């Protein structure tokens, strides 16, 4: 949605390796990166800040596959998966590489129980 890329980036993980030069942090184990409605899931995420320059951070996620989610302004969610997620904050886009797939959802429903017909219904008409 509008404003997502102005939101703070939040990362949750099982383990966190801080490179001692302070410009690289490596996350592993059920990593969840969120920025507004954007959400990335990966087994491994590396965040690099080349040269200590703020705003130029690069977020790389790896999984089998890693997943991506975002709500759009039009109300339709976008979902994707790939072996690698590459998100440069300075840029306005994410890059999905290796078995990359992306989709848009136009309808959904939640509940405690849901039935769904795996055969197509037939037209019911009689003259």
């Amino acid at each position: 949605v509008t404003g997502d890329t102005d939101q703070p980036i939040h990362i949750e993980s099982d383990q966190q390796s801080l490179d001692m030069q302070g410009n690289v942090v490596t996350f592993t184990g059920n990593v969840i990166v969120t920025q507004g409605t954007i959400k990335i899931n990966a087994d491994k995420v590396v965040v690099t800040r080349p040269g200590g320059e703020q705003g130029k951070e690069v977020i790389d996620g790896y999984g089998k596959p890693a997943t991506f989610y975002q709500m759009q302004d039009n109300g339709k969610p976008v979902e994707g998966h790939a072996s690698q997620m590459h998100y440069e904050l300075a840029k306005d886009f994410v890059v999905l590489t290796g078995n990359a797939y992306l989709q848009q959802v136009d309808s959904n429903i939640k509940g405690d129980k849901i039935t769904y017909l795996v055969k197509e219904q037939k037209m019911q008409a009689f003259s």
Binding site: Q7, H10, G55
Partner: peptide, 19 residues
């Protein structure tokens, strides 16, 4: 546009720190 805070948290301790 402007740089955004990057905050990561430890799932075992609940502690967070700004990168």
């Amino acid at each position: 546009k402007k740089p955004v805070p990057i905050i990561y948290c430890n799932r075992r301790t609940g502690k967070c720190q700004r990168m």
